Amino acid sequence: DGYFKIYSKHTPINLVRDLPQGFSALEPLVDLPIGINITRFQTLLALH
Amino acid sequence: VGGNYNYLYRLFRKSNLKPFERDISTEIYQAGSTPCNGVEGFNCYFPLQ
Amino acid sequence: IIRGWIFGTTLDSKTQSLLIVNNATNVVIKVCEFQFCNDPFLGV
Ligand SMILES: *[C@@H]1O[C@H](CO)[C@@H](O[C@@H]2O[C@H](CO)[C@@H](O)[C@H](O)[C@H]2NC(C)=O)[C@H](O)[C@H]1NC(C)=O
Helix, strand or coil: CCCEEEEECCCCCCCCCCCCCCCCCCEEEEEECCCCCCCECCEECEEC | CCCCCCCCCECCCCCCCCCCCCCCCCCCEECCCCCCCCCCCCCEECCEC | CCCEECCECCCCCCCCEEEECCCCCCCCCEEECCCCCCCCCEEC
């Protein structure tokens, strides 16, 4: 409905192989009002 | 007196706009089998009016 | 290294697109019709 909603959570994990087996609900952050038809996306990292 | 043609409205589009959505792109509308690679005419039209 | 995201439709100047950057100490959400690079990364 033209509302980009972002939820997140930070969890101290102990595994270094796969995602941990557990429950951690992601509390919301933002509900920004953008009006695009998002179809694709991409990540942005840093190159020092 | 001129008409105040500064205000524009979109007239040509292929899909019905979703609620609270904005279409600013002014790309040439394609209304036929013509590829419409710019230079509109007889099948391609300016989206704005 | 993982800082942000670029949501969009064509990821270029023909259509609008979002851009989140978690750089410095503030997030930089910004929506324009950016001309995104073939290989986007943060200059640092
Ligand atoms: C939602 O965004 C999508 C992605 O551009 C649009 O889907 C296009 O719809 C047209 C309809 O004529 C198709 O010809 C295209 O092939 C579609 N693009 C794709 C599948 O990538 C859609 O029109 C947008 N809707 C609104 C209301 O803006």
